[PDB]
Amino acid sequence: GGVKVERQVFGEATKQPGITFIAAKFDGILGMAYPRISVNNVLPVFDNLMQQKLVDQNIFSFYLSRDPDAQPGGELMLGGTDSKYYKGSLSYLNVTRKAYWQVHLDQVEVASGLTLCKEGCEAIVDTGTSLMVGPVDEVRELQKAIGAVPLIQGEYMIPCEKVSTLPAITLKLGGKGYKLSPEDYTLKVSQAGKTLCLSGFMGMDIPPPSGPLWILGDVFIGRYYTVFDRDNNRVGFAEAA
Amino acid sequence: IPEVLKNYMDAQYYGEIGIGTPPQCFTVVFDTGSSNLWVPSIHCKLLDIACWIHHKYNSDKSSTYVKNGTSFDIHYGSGSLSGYLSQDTVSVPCQ
């Protein structure tokens, strides 16, 4: 019981990816980006939900309640923002290209003394990607500064013990600067009783005209209360409470 | 944006929604980088682990469902995700 989006077209998959790609836990995907990137021009749920005027304000938010033992999967709110989810206030950025939830990145600065996206760039807020993705020639340098170790095949490993000492990386958005600590940007894995620490950055080139793009995944979003606003076409961040 | 970089195996933002009347619950990944909704279908081509543990949509059991049938098949990075379009009422959350 919550809301009922009528006349929604969707997809029934008769053949879909394995458990190795989509986990047993998730049955499907519910995209929340603009119609322009919608497969076969199918009007997205939220849009329909907008047309049917089912919510007070055409916006929604994600709170990664990742604090104790809350509900896994974060907390999405359709309709508005909620004070309880943040500390202080939200700061917004205008959406630059109405396809992905794309905006403008000012610059990424690494504690050491390195600066990437030096003259600003494009970045899309993506709750579906985990890694922070960026231009390979650009991120190759970051991987370096944080002292990550490139392996063959692609993973830039980081000694599990050395994590605490890695340089905090700070992205500058809307003139404001959001922080990321190694604990936050260093993805860890555990298998058969052993953990593996590795970098959370991805060196991957997005072929234009959509790319070049920096994809801001959950390594960033899990840290800040994020609001996606369709009425005004902006994205706001606030320290997640 | 390549599907390789997509979580989906450990996505952090998911929740339950419903399709049909009565609503059929499905846990999906709330994904701000895509714009389509899709769930498994009862008419799965193969009886694999995916068709076993996942929840699948059954339109036979839905008073609101409206046929469409436009078949689709995009090569979701690694493989191909295929099925067909269908119309119905979505509920958030489900239960």
From Swiss-Prot, chain A:
Catalytic residues, chain numbering: 126
Gene encoding the protein: CTSD
Peptidase A1 domain residues: 1-238
SS bond partners: 117-121, 160-197
Covered residues, full protein: 170 to 410 of 412
Protein name per its UniProtKB record: Cathepsin D heavy chain
Glycosylation sites: 94
